[PDB]
Amino acid sequence: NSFSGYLKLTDNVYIKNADIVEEAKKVKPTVVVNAANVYLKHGGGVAGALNKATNNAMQVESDDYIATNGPLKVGGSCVLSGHNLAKHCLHVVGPNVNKGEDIQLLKSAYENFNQHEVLLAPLLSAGIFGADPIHSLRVCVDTVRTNVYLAVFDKNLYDKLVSSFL
Ligand SMILES: O=C(O)[C@@H]1CCC[C@H]1c1ccc2cnccc2c1
User: Fold this and answer.
1) Taking every annotated instance into account, which residue ranges of this chain make up the domain Macro?
2) Looking at ligand 1, which atom is closest to the CA of residue 124?
3) CA 39 to CA 21: how far, in whole Å?
4) Which helix (H) or strand (E) holds 129?
5) Helices (H) and strands (E) in the chain — how many of each?
6) How far is the centre of ligand 1, averaged over its atoms, from the C-alpha of 48 (Å)?
7) Residues with CB under 6 A from ligand 1
8) Which residue in 9, 27, 64, 146 is a FRET match for 119, CA 20 to 30 A apart?
9) Per DSSP, what are the bridge partners of residue 149?
10) 40-46 contacts: CB < 8 A, separation 24 or more?
């Protein structure tokens, strides 16, 4: 978990302008978080990038999890193999507010991070899930009590977050 170049926002939250896939290949953390959907179909955004970096091994594995256990609930999670990215992948389902899902579930999504001591994660519900990314960071800071290293791909978004926080 040799994280470098992070800015400490709170006692347990760190932030960096970086591609989470590149961070996972360098650090090889214990846990890499995926911003997933209830059926674990990793077709775009963070999910698409993480799956692509495993050459579809994450998708094949996920399809087998769904076949055996059924879909996740919004706000829920499951732990799968991290393959070549991490020891484990914590797939987390944030609400899709652009499809009417309740924003209050963003807290439930972040509560999953608390089961792991150290995590490399993206912001939840901030892609096509349509939630405000600055609001998503506020819920993260208020909810997660374990050590989370957030990797933010977009430099424009990164600078807006760092400015709003500090
Ligand atoms: O950090 C960000 O800018 C956004 C915020 C929530 C989803 C993040 C995202 C989206 C697409 C990505 C594509 N490739 C690699 C990492 C990617 C990360």
Assistant:
1) 1-166
2) 6
3) 22
4) none
5) 6, 7
6) 10
7) 19-21, 35, 45-46, 49, 122-123, 126-127, 133, 152-154, 157
8) 64
9) 14, 120
10) 40/65, 40/66, 40/71, 40/72, 40/78, 40/91, 44/127, 44/128, 45/127, 45/128, 46/20, 46/122, 46/127
Cα 96 to Cα 149: distance, rounded to the nearest angstrom: 23
CA of 110 to the centre of ligand 1 (A): 17
CATH assignment of the domain containing 97: 3.40.220.10
Residue numbers of the domain that contains 100: 1-165
Overall resolution, Å: 1.6
Residue with tokens 């890499």: 32
- Beta strands, E only, 18-93: 31-36, 77-81, 88-93
Q: Name the method of structure determination.
A: X-ray
- Residue 43 Cα to ligand 1 midpoint, Å, equals 13
- Tokens for 46, please give them: 């963070």
Choose which residue among 19, 32, 46 to substitute to test ligand 1 binding: the one with the highest number of ligand atoms within 8 A of its C-beta.
46
For residue 108, give the H/E element and its range. Answer: helix 105-111
Token readout for 124 is 């939840």
